[PDB]
């Protein structure tokens, strides 16, 4: 085959609903955590604990 063979195949896509739900959930949780920590650090802040 190597002498004269070519396989123009595509790329296996991800159809796993479980891992797609997990990826979208974790990315949304991480971006909202990053956003709220950035907005609490660059403004007036409160704390449930002393000096937290």
């Amino acid at each position: 085959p190597h002498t004269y063979i070519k396989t123009p195949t595509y790329r296996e896509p991800v159809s796993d609903y479980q891992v797609l739900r997990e990826k979208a959930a974790s990315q949304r949780r991480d971006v909202e955590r990053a956003l709220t920590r950035f907005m609490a650090k660059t403004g007036e802040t409160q704390s449930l604990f002393k000096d937290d």
Partner: protein, 188 residues
């Protein structure tokens, strides 16, 4: 549902509730309600339903020995410029705090807020919540049964609530709940 799962913590020798000796269960709950309340500060709900639920859950965590029993958060949410549902949830938390911690200055804060608040519905609701969850009943011996408190509540029935007809009946209900139909006992 997160607030319903909170069981009372196992404090040893009245250990101060700090961040390191937190329950491993309650740290996840506290992270979630912190995330929800902070996200409500940026993307608000319909009637701040998540603010009301998170304030209620912080009061649940404070009622058990998890978060320090400090009313300053609820006292900041009970200011005038907030939505009225946030205000009545925060004032419910302050009424529960001054019932459990027998706070004198928080009861004076609530009575001052009854006397001079702009919204009269909030004044009626504070008298209503302080009747439903009273700081003491007539049977209890409490540190808050002075002649000063009897004179304040009699002045609130007599004068002070003379302009509403609903604050005066609420003050009569509060005096009945606290001191009963006879002469206040804790008096000369």
């Amino acid at each position: 549902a997160l607030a319903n799962s909170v069981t009372p913590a196992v404090s040893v020798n009245n250990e101060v509730r700090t961040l390191d000796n937190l329950n491993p269960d309650v740290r996840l709950i506290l992270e979630e309600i912190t995330r929800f309340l902070n996200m409500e500060k940026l993307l608000p709900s319909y009637r701040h339903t998540i603010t009301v639920s998170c304030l209620r859950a912080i009061r649940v965590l404070q009622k058990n020995g998890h978060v320090p029993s400090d009313p300053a958060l609820f006292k900041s949410y009970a200011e005038y410029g907030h939505f009225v549902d946030i205000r009545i949830a925060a004032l419910e938390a302050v009424v529960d705090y001054t019932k459990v911690d027998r706070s004198y200055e928080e009861l004076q804060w609530l009575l001052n807020m009854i006397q001079n608040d702009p919204v009269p519905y909030v004044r009626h609701k504070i008298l209503n919540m302080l009747t439903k969850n009273p700081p003491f009943t007539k049977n209890m011996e409490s540190p808050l049964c002075n002649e000063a408190l009897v004179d304040q509540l009699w002045k609130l029935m007599n004068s002070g609530t003379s302009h509403d007809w609903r604050l005066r009946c609420g003050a009569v209900d509060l005096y009945f709940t606290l001191f009963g139909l006879s002469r206040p006992s804790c008096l000369p």
